[PDB]
Design a protein around this ligand. Structure first.
Ligand SMILES: [Cl-]
Ligand SMILES: [Cl-]
Ligand SMILES: [Cl-]
Ligand SMILES: [Cl-]
Ligand SMILES: [Cu+2]
Ligand SMILES: [Cu+2]
Ligand SMILES: [Cu+2]
Lengths: 283, 283
């Protein structure tokens, strides 16, 4: 039955996966994903099981790890968003000049975003900030700073706590059985209900990785819930890219009209994703 | 049991309603609707029961009656379309400048259309074309040109034939359980499936009025089917007004974007209406 030592084994294993990926990266796309997957697990573990670990160490590690996994996510997020949007436009045509223009506008904008993200990420990976946090992960592959009592402490109550945080958040979401035309400011909260759903997406991930830690170094219902929350997030962000593209100066009316449809489409996918999550969560 | 004489009684009664409305009109909005409702019934009757009536007379009456009921419908169609579209924009906001501008654009355009329709219709009603067809309706209030055999002929087989034409057309529609971005030419058939549904709307009306004729001078399922087909038609025409408004020169991108959403919304109502019809028709 799982203890501090199980927790240490899980942390050492993830740390080692991070160092493997890092070595592969320094011979690339595969390695970066492996770096994300492991960074995110370590960061989660340091949250859920913080009480069994040195507090300062946790607090120093977590934002740095978050900085790493976020920096490494950006290129891919822009790449998948473009694809999602081009697919949706093709579908919504059933390209007329409007759709074709919107497609080319987003291809230009998101490609720039991607290329910018790609170079920023490679810069980050050569930086002294990155090296320092990677060095700590190297230490963690050998030594885990467990608190004195940790080695004998039962991990299950901590995992349960994470499960509770998830289930209480879900209980607080509205049932299902739109704001499709809105403007755009940094003061606008155009889609306010997105935030609780995106928080649940994170809590669900915390719970998944806690189950992993407890098992140490397949629930299909949770995987289905988790897929639905990724579509929620992706559709949400895609809709926002369409809206924002519609504010680009000098675009033709037909282009903005297409982008209006595309924003609406992706907001319809947000709602479907919320329904899918609900069916999966309630079985 | 219904015969030629029942048919004559129904025609005389409708003709008389048309003359009443016409007299009221020449002391207005109420009277014009009554003129439509009766014209349409006479025109239907002359179609369904054409075999019991003088052919030339029928053929002379029908397009003239169609010209009357269509001319008199236009003002109202533009009025209801504006309302439907303003309601939908308010709903779809949940007004931002985009919505507000689209609203004002459509208000201007459809108001012009309405005022133009209103004056064209009053012109038509003062015309010698109108007077000639109204004069024939006056004759029909007294004498019906039944064929020799009509007085003894059973009306039910004719009514049944109309029912069959409806039920066969319905059988030929696709089951349910989009082309949201398209351009606009007089060669474009942007929403091709609309035509069979709109034909069914007319066949259903023919059937309703035949049931009336057979009864002589409440099925809720048929009324529900009929309501769903009116929404289909109204949503269809509303979507086309939004698309067309988006081609107005010099509109702002935000205005076109709103109109894109609104077209999509009304196309979603077309689909819902098709589903509603289907549930009502299959009970
Ligand atoms: Cl930062
Ligand atoms: Cl948005
Ligand atoms: Cl004509
Ligand atoms: Cl259209
Ligand atoms: Cu939005
Ligand atoms: Cu259309
Ligand atoms: Cu839509």
């Amino acid at each position: 039955s799982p203890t501090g030592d199980t927790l240490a084994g899980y942390l050492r294993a993830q740390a080692t996966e991070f160092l493997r990926a890092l070595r592969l990266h320094r011979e690339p796309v595969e390695a970066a994903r492996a770096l994300r997957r492991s960074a995110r697990r370590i960061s989660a573990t340091l949250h859920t099981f913080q009480s069994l670990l040195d507090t300062d160490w946790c607090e120093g590690m977590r934002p740095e790890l978050a900085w790493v996994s976020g920096t490494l996510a950006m290129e891919h997020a822009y790449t998948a968003r473009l694809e999602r949007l081009l697919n949706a436009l093709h579908r919504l045509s059933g390209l007329t000049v409007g759709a074709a223009k919107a497609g080319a506008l987003l291809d230009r904008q998101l490609t720039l975003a991607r290329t910018r993200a790609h170079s920023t990420a490679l810069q980050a990976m050569g930086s002294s900030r990155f090296h320092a946090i990677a060095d700590k992960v190297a230490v963690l592959a050998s030594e885990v700073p467990l608190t004195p009592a940790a080695a004998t402490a039962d991990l299950r109550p901590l995992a349960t706590a994470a499960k509770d945080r998830l289930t209480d958040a879900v209980a607080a979401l509205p049932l299902i059985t739109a704001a499709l035309i809105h403007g755009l400011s940094p003061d606008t909260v155009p889609h306010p209900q997105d935030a609780p759903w995106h928080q649940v997406r994170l809590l669900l991930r915390l719970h998944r990785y806690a189950r992993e830690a407890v098992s140490g170094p397949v629930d299909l219902r949770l995987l289905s819930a988790g897929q639905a929350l990724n579509r929620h997030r992706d559709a949400s962000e895609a809709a926002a890219a369409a809206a924002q593209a519609a504010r680009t100066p000098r675009i033709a009316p037909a282009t903005a009209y297409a982008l209006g449809v595309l924003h609406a489409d992706q907001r319809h996918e947000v709602e479907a994703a919320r329904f899918a999550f609900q069916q999966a969560w309630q079985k």
